[PDB]
Scaffold this active site. Sequence first.
Site: not given
Ligand SMILES: Nc1nc2c(ncn2[C@@H]2O[C@H](COP(=O)(O)OP(=O)(O)O)[C@@H](O)[C@H]2O)c(=O)[nH]1
Ligand SMILES: [Mg+2]
Length: 371
Positions: A15, A18-19, A76
Site C-alpha cells: 500500500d 507500487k501498483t 508480499h
Molecule cells: N494520495 C496518494 N495516494 C496514493 C499514491 N499512490 C498510491 N496511493 C493509494 O494507495 C492505495 C494503495 O496503493 P497501491 O498502488 O495498491 O500500493 P501497493 O500495494 O504497494 O501496490 C491506493 O488506494 C492508492 O489510491 C499517491 O502518490 N498519493
Molecule cells: Mg497494488
Amino acid sequence: RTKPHVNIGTIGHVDHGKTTLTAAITTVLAKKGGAEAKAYDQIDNAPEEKGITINTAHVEYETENRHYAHVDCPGHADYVKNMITGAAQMDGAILVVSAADGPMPQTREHILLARQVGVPYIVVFLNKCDMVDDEELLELVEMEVRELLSEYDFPGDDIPIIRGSALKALEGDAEWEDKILELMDAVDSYIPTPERDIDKPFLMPIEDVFSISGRGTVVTGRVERGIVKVGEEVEIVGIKDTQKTTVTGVEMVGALLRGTKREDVERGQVLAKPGSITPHTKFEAEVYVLSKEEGGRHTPFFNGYRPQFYFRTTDVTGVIELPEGVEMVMPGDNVKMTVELIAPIAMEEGLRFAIREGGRTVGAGVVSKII
Ligand SMILES: Nc1nc2c(ncn2[C@@H]2O[C@H](COP(=O)(O)OP(=O)(O)O)[C@@H](O)[C@H]2O)c(=O)[nH]1
Ligand SMILES: [Mg+2]
C-alpha cells in the site's frame, strides 16, 4: 531502433504505491509515445506465472534511450517468490516508500532480499508526497531510507531519490507527472546497461547423454549463457571430478564431445568454459518455503532436514541448517539457510534451485554465498 534492455520492478511495503506508480509510468510515457498506458486495475489484478505460483504483472515502456521490462506483484508473498525463483529477474529495482508512513519492515525485507538474490541497483521513489507538507519530516524519512540501504550494502549516499505522487500523476496533474519523468531520468542514468548472457562464460546444463555410431558421444542441453563454437575445449563440472574435452560440433543443442565416453558424463553436470565455474557442496541460500495451500508442506523445516535440491537438471540431497535461534520454519515463510550437499554441483551466486521431497516441491531458493 532497438534500444538497450533493462529488467526492473517496483518493490516496497504493501500500500505504499507500487501498483499506482507502475500505472503512472506507463500513462505518462504514453504521452511521449513511449508506452501503451495501463490502468491501475490491470496491474493490480496480476496474471499467474509458474513448480510455484506467482502473481506477476508485466508492463513495457521506453524512454528515448532504453526499453524496460517492468514487473509488479500484488502481495508480499509474490515479491519473496518472484525475487527468489527469479521468474523475472531484475537488473534494478524501483523502491517505493510512503512519505507519510516511512520505511517499514517489508521495505527492509525487500532491500535485504534484493541484496541477497543479486539485484545490483536501486532507485527510490518517495511516494505520496501530496499528503505531506513538512519538509523536515521528508528529510528525515529520506535519511532513514539511505541508512537502511547502506545497512545492506547499497550505496545509500549515491542512490537517487525522487519525491513524487504516483496517484496525482496518474490523474494527470502535469506538475506531479514531471516527477515521473525525473524518476525515469534517474533510472536511465543510474542503472547501468546489463551485460549480455552471451558475453558471459559459456554454460550448458547436461540433460541427456547418447552414443550414436558415427558421432561418438552426444550431450544435449540448453545454453544458459555464453557461446560455444567448433573445436573449443570445455570442462565438465559437477558430481564427478572435473575433466576436459573438446567440442567437435554443435548440431541443434546436441554437443558432440570429442573424447568423452558415455559413462564418464551424466545428467546434472554442466559444460563450461574452463575455469569459469567450479564445484561446491556448501553454500548459503535464501529460501522460500511453500505454504500449505500451495501443495507444499504442512510441517515446518528443521535443522538436519535432508531434502533434495534440484539444480538445473537433477536432484541432489543435502542437509539443512537454519539461522542462529531458529529451529522451525513455517510453511509460507522464507529464511536464509546453510546447505551441505551429498555431492558437488557447479555452483555460483545467483543459481536458482527447487527444494523437493520425493516428487513434491516444498521450497525454492537462490544461492547467495559460496563456501
Ligand atoms: N494520495 C496518494 N495516494 C496514493 C499514491 N499512490 C498510491 N496511493 C493509494 O494507495 C492505495 C494503495 O496503493 P497501491 O498502488 O495498491 O500500493 P501497493 O500495494 O504497494 O501496490 C491506493 O488506494 C492508492 O489510491 C499517491 O502518490 N498519493
Ligand atoms: Mg497494488
